[PDB]
Amino acid sequence: QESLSSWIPENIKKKECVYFVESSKLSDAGKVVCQCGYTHEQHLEEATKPHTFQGTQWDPKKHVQEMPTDAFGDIVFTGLSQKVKKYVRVSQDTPSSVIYHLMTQHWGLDVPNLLISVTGGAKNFNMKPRLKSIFRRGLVKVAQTTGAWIITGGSHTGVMKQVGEAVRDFSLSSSYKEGELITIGVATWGTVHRREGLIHPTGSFPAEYILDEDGQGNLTCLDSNHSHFILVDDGTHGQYGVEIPLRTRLEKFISEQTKERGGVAIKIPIVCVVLEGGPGTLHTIDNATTNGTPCVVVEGSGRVADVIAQVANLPVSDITISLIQQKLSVFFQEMFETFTESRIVEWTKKIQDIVRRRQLLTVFREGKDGQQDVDVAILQALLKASRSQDHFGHENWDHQLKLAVAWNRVDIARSEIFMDEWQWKPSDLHPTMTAALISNKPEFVKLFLENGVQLKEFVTWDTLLYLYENLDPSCL
């Protein structure tokens, strides 16, 4: 406990300005602001000075300073539940690695088999009941069965609050391993309502936190359903966007590390699902799908979503900017017109580019076709992506299979991995069979038996010696 308690300040820094020269424009009575106005006659936490420099417009490069943070520890939503949650405040420029390291070691988190980065519109809204039901159902199910992290913002608005309701729904059920569904919150420390309540050195392990819906201005509060909360900060209070430059760095760094169980070893796969969203969401969607990281969108209740759901079927280059103009016009209907002509052509470019990559994407088509369940969809999505990745040979079937069994569920592989088109040879499964046993997964064993792996041909001497090295350590 104290180990991490000391470790965090030993490792992390938080930002704060050292240049005290008042802002230009005054805030809501916030005339005591040096362009940031956190708390002082200026934006100062030390001697309210120009940092020995009467140099106006002293940039954050010339104003802000990073120093060990007095804003970590454990927390609890006071007057809301009995469970506790982990939080931490983090500077902007911080190696993604050390965060991952804290997460696994100092927080005791197992390397997960899947990384759902969900996004949408910070706006609040609703959707059809049937769609909402199937969505929350499939999402929480697939997040648990594969042991997947789930990463998003943390404010109490938008689809973040929606999925917060979803995970809380499961924890209301929480049949077993209520800690299964783990969700981490990625928001900006500048936009926090009662944040002072935890600013305390040497750990604030029992950390009460008030909350007040609508009891706040531009600054927001937290959703009250996530499991962990990182807070990014630049040294600025009323500002936005201090999150993405790290979030990208982070999720990318996770798409690289490898897991190795049984005998198999693979790289963690990462797929992102998006909700109603808007323009900026469209920007991020493309900026990801150009990096292999595929996407899945729900056909229903989406401004930037349903438009793509519609254009799903239209072949490329058949999308005129006028089609789009009336589309966005009939869809937005509040900002339907405020779009310059100098951006709608940009949007034609983006959307036509996205639909060009005819594999990394996937419609949902709620109810009518292929709408079996949300999970299986995500599976086929990430799977087809992996398959489309370039290769030399058929070890790609090996890759699909190594995955389908890395995640516990089998239905997938027996459904498609062994359908046809490989003409594999049973002597090309023994590495898998190995990991199938050591991990106590009988179903796959029955499987490869049905596809004829020959025990007598299989259980050789060395392999036998192997299996006797990795018995479950608990056994007498």
């Binding site: 072949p315 490329v316 280059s317 058949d318």
Partner: peptide
């Protein structure tokens, strides 16, 4: 019987140029 009737429940409630 139970697994069979559930199936009834489920069914019954369900029903470019070169650039």
């Amino acid at each position: 019987i139970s697994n069979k009737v559930d199936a009834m429940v489920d069914l019954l409630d369900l029903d470019g140029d070169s650039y």
